[PDB]
RNA sequence: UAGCGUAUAUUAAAGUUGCUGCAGUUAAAAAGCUCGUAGUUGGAUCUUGGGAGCGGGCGUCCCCGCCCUCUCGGCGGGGCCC
């Protein structure tokens, strides 16, 4: 299988040449080939969600995500279409580093790759199309937390029924768990 | 009570020297006012929940073990090892 759009560490390719392949006969497409030949992924997943509902998620470097980012809406659409049933969503690889501690010659740790950062980035690209607009972690009573994100009601018609999946995702690849909610106009 | 009084130094009483812990309108006590160097003090932010068996009951509590590094390991190149 041509799998020619899948840069790795160095080997890991585990029969997910489905995206690949459904990213090749989204070659010969409508004006999608000027923006999408230099840019490739890293990794997807298939990851459980909710009930028996499946959601894939894509790993892209993050200039590539940026790209990604500028033309996600119509290239989700379509292969969603492709993969019925599934929700698709796009993940920078973000390279969390550990926190330094007492114990050759290092460098200082960039803020952004902290996991605090990370988390937030991650927590950003997962929505795209709607945008975050607050958030409302809340300790309930157990040592545990539950956060909130308020979405920003204009893309509310795009992504509502999406918002399990996000929980899901984020509950996944992060730990914690978040609600989403549309409050009214600021 | 075989002891008891007096003088003086000192401690508690004394939160009447105050770190614990005092005061400063009118009782004694905030500088006429501002700048200012030592001194004293100084906002938020970088690892957290799922982690590995013993684990105060995997019993959604948890004795608790976290699922630092590498050049000779010495129990120029075999696992039993440090
Ligand atoms: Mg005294
Ligand atoms: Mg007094
Ligand atoms: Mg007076
Ligand atoms: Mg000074
Ligand atoms: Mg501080």
């Known amino acids: ?11 890991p390719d585990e029969f997910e ?13 409508s004006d999608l080939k000027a923006q999408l030949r230099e840019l490739n992924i890293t990794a997807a997943k298939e990851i459980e969600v909710g009930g028996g509902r499946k959601a894939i998620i894509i790993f892209v470097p993050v200039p590539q ?4 980012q500028k033309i996600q809406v119509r290239l989700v659409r379509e292969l969603e279409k492709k993969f019925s049933g599934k929700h698709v ?12 501690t007492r114990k ?6 960039p803020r952004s790759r902290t996991l605090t950062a990370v988390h937030d980035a991650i927590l950003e690209d997962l929505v795209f199309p709607s ?26 018609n795009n992504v ?12 996944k690849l992060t730990g914690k768990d978040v609600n989403f909610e549309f409050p009214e106009f600021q």
């Open 1 to 11: 299988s041509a799998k020619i759009v899948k840069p790795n560490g160095e080997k």
């Open 17 to 29: 040449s489905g995206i690949s392949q459904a990213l090749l006969e989204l070659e010969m497409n």
């Open 65 to 68: 995500l940026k790209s990604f």
């Open 89 to 100: 969503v796009f993940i920078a690889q973000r390279r969390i580093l550990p926190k330094p």
């Open 104 to 109: 050759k010659n290092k460098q200082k740790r």
């Open 131 to 156: 945008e975050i607009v607050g958030k409302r972690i809340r300790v309930k009573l157990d040592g545990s937390r539950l956060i909130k994100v308020h979405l920003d009601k204009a893309q509310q």
């Open 160 to 171: 509502e029924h999406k918002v399990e999946t996000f929980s899901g995702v984020y509950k």
